[PDB]
């Protein structure tokens, strides 16, 4: 039905919100510290000197183990 | 249809995976450091000495800003 389409689109958007904002291919699993933005996979986070959301310098990257992984 | 039910169930489980494992009411937004388990809201994480998943000592809690928030 039309409701099946609405739910498929909601599910798609929630899964896309878990994808790395730089490569668009891998799951987010890394936090930029100290700002706390958690928007990248480990490979893209290792290559950024400043946060792609807030431009704060990245002091270090913290791996996150999320139940959604 | 039956497919609408299947999608409703999938959506529900993905949303439940984002809830604090301790209070079951607030969204996860905190990481235990250095282990990296990200399973609690700020209030429940504040008072734990050891990680509730792996028992490692919590040296500090890092706030996380997730796109799913
Ligand atoms: C926070 N996530 C942003 C993001 C990264 N990638 N995509 C994406 C990828 C393929 C198709 C549609 C969307 C969304
Ligand atoms: C990782 N999240 C675990 C969790 C916490 N709470 N709930 C939950 C709450 C209400 C209804 C169904 C499930 C799941
Ligand atoms: Zn990436
Ligand atoms: Zn940032
Ligand atoms: Zn809680
Ligand atoms: Zn842990």
Swiss-Prot record, chains A, B:
Residues 64-66 are annotated as: Critical for homodimerization. It comes from Homo sapiens. E3 ubiquitin-protein ligase that mediates ubiquitination and subsequent proteasomal degradation of myosin regulatory light chain (MRLC), LDLR, VLDLR and LRP8. Activity depends on E2 enzymes of the UBE2D family. Proteasomal degradation of MRLC leads to inhibit neurite outgrowth in presence of NGF by counteracting the stabilization of MRLC by saposin-like protein (CNPY2/MSAP) and reducing CNPY2-stimulated neurite outgrowth. Acts as a sterol-dependent inhibitor of cellular cholesterol uptake by mediating ubiquitination and subsequent degradation of LDLR. The chain holds residues 369 to 436 of 445 of the full protein. Autoubiquitinated. Induction: Expression is directly activated by NR1H2 and NR1H3. Expression is not dependent of the sterol-response element-binding proteins (SREBPs). Expression is indirectly induced by LDL. This is E3 ubiquitin-protein ligase MYLIP. Ubiquitously expressed. A zinc finger (RING-type) spans 20-55. It is found in: Cytoplasm; Cell membrane. Changing residue 20 to A: Abolishes autoubiquitination. The RING domain mediates ubiquitination and the neurite outgrowth inhibitory activity. The FERM domain binds phospholipids and mediates lipoprotein receptors recognition at the plasma membrane through their cytoplasmic tails. Homodimer. Interacts with the E2 ubiquitin-conjugating enzyme, UBE2D1 (via RING-type zinc finger). Interacts with myosin regulatory light chain (MRLC) and TMEM4.
């Amino acid at each position: 039905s039309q409701q099946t389409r609405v739910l498929q689109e909601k599910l798609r958007k929630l899964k896309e919100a878990m994808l790395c904002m730089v490569c668009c291919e891998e799951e987010i699993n890394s936090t930029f510290c100290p700002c706390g933005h958690t928007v990248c996979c480990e490979s893209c986070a290792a290559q950024l000197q400043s946060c792609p959301v807030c431009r704060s310098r990245v002091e270090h990257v913290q791996h996150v183990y999320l139940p959604t992984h």
